[PDB]
Design a protein around this ligand. Structure first.
Ligand SMILES: Nc1ncnc2c1ncn2[C@@H]1O[C@H](CSCC[C@H](N)C(=O)O)[C@@H](O)[C@H]1O
Lengths: 8, 160
């Protein structure tokens, strides 16, 4: 299970 | 100075720092429960450039190809930073171990850095700007922005 970094 | 003048001067400082890749005022430390983190070694002021989130700039097809490959190796960490630019999805993939520090900065929803998209003549960069004064010795933190149930279930530290 991976997560991301996401620009908001 | 006018707003335009102040904006031009800021763009100039930022462009210079993106060019040089200079990453002063920071060091790596082990932070309890987080692995490595980056800590300030000098005070940063609200609005200051901190660091570029630096890595392999890629488009969506390659990003998915790499994700599917990383997902097969549990030892591989999470360093892929997605964003939208000119109606397309881009990713700064910082998975490869380098000496650049942006990739090592940990997550908080209530951190002290804010990521911005900064365009230089059509080339996008992700940069971290101090959202408040940062004390010497404190950990740099920004909001990773992944709020998905799929991620939070497996990584509850994303919730705060
Ligand atoms: N608030 C937090 N709590 C626990 N772990 C965190 C965290 N923020 C980031 N991380 C960790 O940092 C990884 C993203 S890359 C950030 C650098 C990483 N700590 C390292 O030593 O290489 C996350 O997948 C998780 O392992």
């Amino acid at each position: 299970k991976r997560h991301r970094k996401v620009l908001r | 100075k006018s707003k335009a003048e102040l904006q031009s001067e800021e763009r100039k400082r930022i462009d210079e720092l993106i060019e040089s890749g200079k990453e002063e005022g920071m060091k790596i430390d082990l932070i309890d429960g987080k692995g490595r983190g980056v800590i300030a070694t000098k005070q940063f002021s609200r609005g200051d450039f901190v660091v570029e989130y630096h890595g392999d700039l890629i488009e969506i097809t390659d990003a998915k190809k790499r994700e599917a490959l990383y997902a097969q190796d549990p030892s591989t960490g999470c360093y892929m930073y997605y964003f939208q630019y000119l109606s397309k999805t881009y990713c700064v993939d910082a998975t490869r171990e380098t000496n650049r520090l942006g990739r090592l900065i940990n997550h908080s929803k209530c951190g002290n850095c804010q990521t911005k998209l900064h365009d230089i003549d059509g080339v996008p960069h992700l940069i971290l700007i101090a959202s408040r004064d940062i004390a010497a010795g404190e950990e740099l933190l920004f909001d990773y922005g992944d709020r998905s149930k799929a991620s939070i279930e497996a990584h509850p530290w994303l919730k705060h």
